[PDB]
Amino acid sequence: SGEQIFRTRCSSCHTVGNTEPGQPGIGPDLLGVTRQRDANWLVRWLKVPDQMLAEKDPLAMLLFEQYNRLAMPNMRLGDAEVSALISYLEEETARLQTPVTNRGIP
Numbered sequence: 001s002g003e004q005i006f007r008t009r010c011s012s013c014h015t016v017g018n019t020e021p022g023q024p025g026i027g028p029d030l031l032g033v034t035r036q037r038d039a040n041w042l043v044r045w046l047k048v049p050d051q052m053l054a055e056k057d058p059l060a061m062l063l064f065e066q067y068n069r070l071a072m073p074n075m076r077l078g079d080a081e082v083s084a085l086i087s088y089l090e091e092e093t094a095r096l097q098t099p100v101t102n103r104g105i106p
């Protein structure tokens with residue numbers, strides 16, 4: 001269900017596997033981030049991003065200047081609408097990880 005949420009309030013700056021190599025577009029690749037970044041921070045950042053950057057909470061201040069020097073605004077989503085989108089990033093990562101010694105596209 002989180003895939004429909006991605007397509008309607010998220011795909012404007014993102015993908016789940018499909019940035020350009022070492023070139024993060026308007027916003028970096030979400031596939032596998034659920035198993036790299038802190039699992040509380042990932043969901044909380046999505047609920048208050050431009051105001052976490054205004055708190056000067058330094059985890060964000062470090063990461064944003066190293067992708068594309070652009071800020072993410074708050075989309076103003078609801079908690080259960082976020083929970084479904086967390087389950088899209090988690091379950092699409094669980095299927096589209098493609099560790100078959102062939103993830104590339106010819």
Ligand code: HEC
Pocket residue numbers: 009010011012013014026027028030033037042046049063064067068070071072073075085
């Ligand atoms: C363009 C205005 C954006 C929209 C809309 C969304 N995101 Fe984003 N994202 C954007 C940038 C510039 C960056 C870097 C700063 C930051 O927001 O962290 C990102 C990054 C992420 C990350 C963190 C990646 C990491 O290295 O850990 C996540 C997990 C993320 N964004 C999630 C996310 C979701 C779920 C959104 C749709 C509802 C969303 N973003 C919208 C820019 C933009």
